[PDB]
Ligand binder design. Sequence first.
Ligand SMILES: CNC(=O)c1c(-c2ccc(O)cc2)oc2ccc(O)c(CN3CCC4(COC4)C3)c12
Length: 267
Amino acid sequence: GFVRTLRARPEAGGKVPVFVFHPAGGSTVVYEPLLGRLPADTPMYGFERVEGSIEERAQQYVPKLIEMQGDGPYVLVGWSLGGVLAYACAIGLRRLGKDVRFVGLIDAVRAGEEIPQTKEEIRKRWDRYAAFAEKTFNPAIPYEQLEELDDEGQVRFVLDAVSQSIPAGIIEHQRTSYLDNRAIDTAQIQPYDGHVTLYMADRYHDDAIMFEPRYAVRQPDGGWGEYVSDLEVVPIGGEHIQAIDEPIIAKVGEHMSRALGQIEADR
Ligand SMILES: CNC(=O)c1c(-c2ccc(O)cc2)oc2ccc(O)c(CN3CCC4(COC4)C3)c12
């Protein structure tokens, strides 16, 4: 289905599982370095890609989480897009009366300024892509047809226009890559009352920034303090893309190991 078993829990008993959520344009196999930095026999389950907006995706994850974990306790972790998803499932699980005891965001850092959900920003965004496209591959943007479509329809319209004038594999990967990245842009973040740990790097890469220049700035709280009162930030340095790999993940994992040991003590 959409759940990957990174390390199975025992048939009965054992430690609380860690649930990790896939990143944008990728799979939960990227949490394997983190797993090696966690306590021995920590179970870990990865939730992979499903369709919908952020809240509609959590409408599919939450019932599976409760099948696998019941009342709790819940430990939800995600890098890149995964962080938003883990947080979204923290809010869904809290409303159902579930015990969430750790939400771990690995550099799930919001744009320094809010991204407007407007028609003018649609036009600004498609002009930005258009200019890059003539550069890296050597016309009139039909704005009225694009402003009336969602992200999925926008992308289909633009691929169909190329066909009307590319191998299937390249297309499928960039379609999910782009859509997951827009899912981060468009996320409508809801307040959460539990404890959130945010592992914060220094900066997004110059590729991400060129796609949306408002990622050139990060607030100290990563954009989350308005929505979380019990917010902890762990500075890890480096770039967004290296927060998930060795050796920086060793710093993430040492911190998370202490949080999991405390959760195991209170059981
Ligand atoms: C190229 N980099 C990317 O991030 C993006 C890709 C894209 C397209 C095709 C691919 O194959 C791979 C990626 O589409 C996007 C659409 C909107 C957007 O605002 C961004 C910028 N991202 C949004 C959230 C972000 C901050 O944390 C990650 C950066 C992107």
